Symmetry: D2
Subunit: 119 residues, 4 copies
Amino acid sequence: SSCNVTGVWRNELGSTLRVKAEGSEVRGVYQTAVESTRGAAGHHRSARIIGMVSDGTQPTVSFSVLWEKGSCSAWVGQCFILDDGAQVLKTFWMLRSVADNLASAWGSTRMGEDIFFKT
Amino acid sequence: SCNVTGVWRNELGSTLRVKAEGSEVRGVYQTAVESTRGAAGHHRSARIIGMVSDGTQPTVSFSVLWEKGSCSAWVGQCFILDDGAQVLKTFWMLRSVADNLASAWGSTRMGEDIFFKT
Amino acid sequence: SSCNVTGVWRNELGSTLRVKAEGSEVRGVYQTAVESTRGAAGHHRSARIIGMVSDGTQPTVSFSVLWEKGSCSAWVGQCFILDDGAQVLKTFWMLRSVADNLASAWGSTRMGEDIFFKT
Amino acid sequence: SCNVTGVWRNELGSTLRVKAEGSEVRGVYQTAVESTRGAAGHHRSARIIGMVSDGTQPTVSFSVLWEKGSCSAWVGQCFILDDGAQVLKTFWMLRSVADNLASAWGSTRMGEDIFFKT
Ligand SMILES: O=C(O)CCCC[C@@H]1SC[C@@H]2NC(=O)N[C@@H]21
Ligand SMILES: O=C(O)CCCC[C@@H]1SC[C@@H]2NC(=O)N[C@@H]21
Ligand SMILES: O=C(O)CCCC[C@@H]1SC[C@@H]2NC(=O)N[C@@H]21
Ligand SMILES: O=C(O)CCCC[C@@H]1SC[C@@H]2NC(=O)N[C@@H]21
């Protein structure tokens, strides 16, 4: 019983992650159900993702998103296959907001946990 | 204008060879340090994949898959200091493999990496 | 309707947090269900808490824990009252492992999310 | 030994006055910066409460509650260098007040603070 990163995923915020694994890379499309300020994520709150995925029964993943307005996000996670059979992607993320210069950037990094379930 | 393409070095002694073609970043990462011995394999090198914005002080996000299945990610921004230096200010996460969901709580480390240009 | 920080909470790993407010401070007991390396959290996987709670309806909290073998942890968070009447304590945490020196400390900090519910 | 008790300053210019009592730390933090005008109060100072371990290079964990409801926590270690210099090495989180659960998703920031002595 394997956890397969390829698929369509939904997080606890209601964001959708559509992902295709090929070789050791991932591509696809992230639609965020929220943004940090109006505009940030763009026209349909959507952007391309690019990243890596490991081999194995419970693979690790890492992937990046650049948001239309110049902020950017990164996730690292592992695909686990639960005892009830649900496929689950446990991730932490960083969101990096554009700063004006180095001195004002101390506060430009946010973090959190996204849990993605297959739909 | 700060530019991401080039060869960089961090406070740990690690090296980052980066090349942008537009919004994409590719390259190679050599880490001077490892969480377990050989976790990054014998050359401690891996490929890098990510994104870089446009603008003069662009933001950057990139991932590395390590040889034995851990993976790191960096976000940051390319700054021109007063003195002419180009600096990549980043924060990273290192995700170690875990056996099951229940052991995964302790799987994510973080830190800050300052990359300077060789 | 408010969120009340005082009491016994339980998070996703089964760890129990007992909070007593004394003014702006919080004191109490943390019993972790899990530890890094056997005995890191001491004989009873238990230690005391110290920190702060704000004055809202939905207060923010900050608290810290020194474990027996010297690693330390801190959580920051807010106490939300939900539509269904439930009180959820939403935190993020940092675990600091002891290192021998500055250079080998690069990997000494881990992070996660803890969602506490009231018992 | 590295001694936590004292007056400390970090890369941002913020000042940290702490004293140690058993395994408890107390004192005042004066931040050189804030998220919004006045988040740290008119004087940008607040009390600190936390913990410090025994040993030659002790670990530390402290909190601060800010005037307008946000809060910050630091975890770290007091490393003593070759040159005899004492150095507090930390990572922090800053939680901002949110109106409700759903809109709290982006309410946590982090960073590194490195403190030197006066
Ligand atoms: O606010 C921004 O700068 C762009 C949108 C940010 C979306 C973030 S990425 C991490 C978190 N998880 C989500 O699904 N959305 C938010
Ligand atoms: O430990 C592993 O699982 C593989 C090596 C990780 C190297 C990390 S990546 C974050 C940090 N920055 C560096 O330059 N090296 C370490
Ligand atoms: O591993 C150690 O060094 C001591 C025990 C740490 C337990 C951590 S603290 C954050 C997380 N949440 C819990 O409930 N327990 C773990
Ligand atoms: O913005 C706020 O809500 C309150 C002030 C935050 C000050 C932060 S705490 C982490 C960082 N280190 C400092 O010395 N100052 C900032």
